[PDB]
Write a protein that binds this DNA or RNA. Structure first.
Lengths: 388, 50, 200, 345
RNA sequence: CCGCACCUCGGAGAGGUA
């Protein structure tokens, strides 16, 4: 109802002669034209979307994901969308700065160089999760990891803790938590808890909207990276997204074990590998949560295929989660490749000694030891100094 | 679902949406069959009658 | 021996889709439906096969009743008199076994029955997972408005229904509206059980 | 109208009552079906129905109130406990619940619990606010449980005095007098300390010896003969230890007279998923019985848990020897018996 | 359908019939 009221108000205001302003993310269709979707509707096709002529797209070399803000006009007799007259701001910047840009496909990838420390530093009991995460698997800019965990392991609490630690330590980073095929109540809870942008697509609509929202989000992330921004995407839907792609892919006659199409894992693997660290400027970090032991062999095949792709695995133990010990992290199975590029020599040596001491002990025993050692102090520096 | 075609390929049991398109005799006309010819495209395997 | 169905029941099963009994029940129900659709004026035919090497036999049954309704599937008590009238009313299993009729084209509806029972087993698995993760108020979308019953929707191959007596007498629902209701029990409804939801 | 009261009545009186109430012929029917039909017909009249039993929470969330007279066996007349009530009253395994129950409706097979009247033989307000067993400070045996057929008890008291919260091991070879010694111990516990909850937990024993022990001592004898699988043995042991822990949390002096050092260990080794040690025992197979044994302790805030076990050595299997050598380092009391003296009577 | 191995339904043209 609000959209029709705004439409009528804008019409009455344009009848007087005043200017009308709009904003939205561009979604170029296959025919050549596009529309400016809205953020409050999770990039959903609305009746009051702003039409974008192909002439302006050719003039400014606009692509899917470009945030466009400019003057619009109400539709005339025979039109159903707002025509874009003049664009004022492109991607929160002037068009003269966006015209001389380098495409995302030409950026040179690199390994994680900058250290994104997750430790809060306030000495809270909730900071233990971030401390264990930093001790087990340090995360840097451009990291491409996977949160491997069975159902009912603590993915929600761990994701909330990660989001809060990111918003606390690194408020300059653009945090985007894209939740696909999840409960609406959980979406509402997350949106009113984390300090950032929350786009979601619940199961109430088919997988086409899921794929469309995923494409819009990845295009916006690529454009922001092109504009020298540090984008961090926490997509806890990678398994759901792979299921959606396998459901919407045309049959090719080559079905793998478990009901997986031969060309179904192409789009999600490309979405995952899109994350990379750019040397010219900016980075893209994608932390996804994979589902295992869900009773379906399709998810097992998806996990086994995506295991050889990322460079960071955070395994969670079902036993430790059932014992109500959070975070229930499998320290032995966790780790990060090329960790010497994110940690110093002494920090790497301390982590190596801690792993050599923890490995002989059992999972529950190692977790109890780590908790008892971290409870004695507030910062990990005192723990490191006492271990020696 | 791409899983049902895998099952159809596992066993020799037929399973498809069969529509009848057989050649029938028009009304009024009759007679006795005196000759039957069968022409098969190259590569395709012949059948019992052929 | 029918090695064709044997290889199917031995290979396709054991993957949580076929428990070695529901697969045989679905296969015999599909064979019964095929035999029913084969005859014109002969309905209600059943078949029971619960063995690997043992082939299936089609024994057409009649409904034991003292009346003459449905003369195509009704029998009299004089046929049960051979058993000293032990066949009480309401139970219908006795007759001579007749010639079985197997065919490859009968597998068309058999595959449909098999995939329908697999979808029902997946629905039961979703019910089990819901019970494992129950304890919160859920929202659902109504699909149809029938007499003294409605439906709920949670798109994970799940479904729920609410009894009208438990709902408000004034409130009438319509498809597309979200409904808040806590489920408490699942009665074994025919052709698969359904999660019953109550508001009062 | 109680479930156990109807389950303890003879068959003749139940058949007579059912024929008086005017139901189907109960002579050619099982006792459980008779009780079920009687409860249904009584609920149709309008009177209330009550039941009781020890709670066993399943993996799906719900639980059942197992009966004591059935040696904690899943029966058709179990009291269904919804997960909502478990989350409301903070119910756990071992919580004996007694309240108004109703016969299952069309399509159900278990009695539903409407309102709980008593929790663990105490008010629910005292049970909802309680100190967990893990928080209770363990201590050594302080109060003396004097055992002084009395010659065996006198010898036991002179050798190793047993008190509240004791953790002993009666080590004896085969045919050394374990049966008579256990009978004497049970009689002394039932005679000297009738306030303690005596539970003779038997696993994989002769049915004749089970029915002889149950109808001889004055207490509860939960047993599981060899006709039952090892999973049922493990489940009964877990139910017993959970009930004991809950009673100790309710300030009760429980005495677990265990005689399954070897039987329960073999059960755990058979039911443990597949680390090979000496004798064929898994590395994680002895952890559960180790915690079962170590659960016995003296509580300063109130109550105590005593577990007096009987070991089996020289049985011809090195597995039992390894089990005994592992369990010896956990307890603090060993009472060895001589085969040479036993063979001479 | 995931791994073989025992110690306590139409348009154009041609021909014809009345």
């Amino acid at each position: 109802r609000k959209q029709d009221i705004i439409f009528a108000i804008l019409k009455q205001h344009a009848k007087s002669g005043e200017d009308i302003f709009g904003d939205g993310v561009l979604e170029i269709l296959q025919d050549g034209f596009g529309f400016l979707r809205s953020a409050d509707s999770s990039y959903l096709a609305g009746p009051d979307d702003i039409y974008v002529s192909p002439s302006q797209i050719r003039r400014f070399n606009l692509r899917t994901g470009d945030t466009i803000s400019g003057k619009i006009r109400p539709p005339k007799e025979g039109e159903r969308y707002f025509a874009l007259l003049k664009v004022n701001e492109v991607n929160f910047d002037k068009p003269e700065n966006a015209r001389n840009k380098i495409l995302f496909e030409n950026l040179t990838p690199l390994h994680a160089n900058s250290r994104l420390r997750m430790e809060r530093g306030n000495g809270s009991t909730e900071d233990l999760t971030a401390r264990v995460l930093d001790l087990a698997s340090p995360i840097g800019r451009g990291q491409r990891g996977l949160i491997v965990a069975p159902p009912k392991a603590g993915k929600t609490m761990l994701l909330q803790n990660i989001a809060q630690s990111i918003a606390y330590n690194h408020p300059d980073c653009v945090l985007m938590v894209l939740l696909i095929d999840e409960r609406p109540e959980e979406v509402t809870e997350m949106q009113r808890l984390v300090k950032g942008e929350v786009v979601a697509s619940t199961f109430d609509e088919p997988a086409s909207r899921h794929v469309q929202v995923a494409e819009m989000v990845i295009e916006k992330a690529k454009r922001l990276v092109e504009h020298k921004k540090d984008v961090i995407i926490l997509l806890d839907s990678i398994t759901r997204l792979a299921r959606a792609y396998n459901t919407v892919v045309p049959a090719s006659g080559k079905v793998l074990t478990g009901g997986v199409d031969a060309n179904a894992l192409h789009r999600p693997k490309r979405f995952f590998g899109a994350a990379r660290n750019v040397e010219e400027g900016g980075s893209l970090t994608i932390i996804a949560t994979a589902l295992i032991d869900t009773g379906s062999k399709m998810d097992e095949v998806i996990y086994e295929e995506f295991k050889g792709t990322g460079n960071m695995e955070l395994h969670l133990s079902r036993k430790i989660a059932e014992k109500r010990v959070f975070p229930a992290i499998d320290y032995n199975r966790s780790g990060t490749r090329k960790e010497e590029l994110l940690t110093t020599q002494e920090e790497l040596q301390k982590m190596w000694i801690l792993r050599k001491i923890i490995h002989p002990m059992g999972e529950i025993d190692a977790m109890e030891f780590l908790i008892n050692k971290l409870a004695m102090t507030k910062t990990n520096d005192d723990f490191f100094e006492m271990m020696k | 679902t791409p899983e049902e075609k895998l099952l159809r390929a596992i066993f020799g049991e037929k399973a498809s949406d069969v529509k009848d398109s057989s050649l029938r005799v028009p009304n009024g006309v009759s007679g006795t069959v005196i000759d039957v010819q069968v022409f098969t495209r190259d590569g395709v395997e012949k059948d019992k009658r052929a | 021996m029918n090695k064709e169905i044997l290889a199917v029941v031995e290979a396709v099963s054991n993957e949580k889709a076929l428990p070695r009994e529901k697969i045989f029940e679905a296969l015999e129900s599909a064979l019964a439906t095929a035999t029913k659709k084969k005859y014109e004026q002969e309905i209600d035919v059943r078949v029971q096969i619960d063995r690997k090497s043992g082939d299936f036999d089609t024994f057409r049954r009649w409904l034991v009743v003292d009346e003459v309704t449905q003369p195509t599937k009704e029998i009299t008590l004089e046929a049960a008199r051979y058993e000293d009238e032990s066949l009480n009313l309401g139970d219908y299993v006795e007759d001579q076994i007749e010639s079985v009729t197997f065919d490859r084209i009968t597998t068309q509806t058999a595959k449909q029955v098999i995939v329908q029972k697999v979808r029902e087993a997946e629905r039961a698995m979703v019910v089990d997972q819901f019970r494992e993760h129950e304890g919160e108020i859920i929202t659902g979308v109504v699909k149809k408005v029938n007499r003294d019953n409605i439906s709920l929707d949670l798109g994970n191959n799940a479904e729920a229904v609410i009894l009208r007596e438990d709902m408000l007498p004034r409130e009438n629902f319509r498809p597309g509206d979200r409904v808040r209701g806590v489920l408490y029990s699942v009665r074994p409804e025919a052709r698969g059980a359904q999660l019953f939801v109550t508001r009062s």
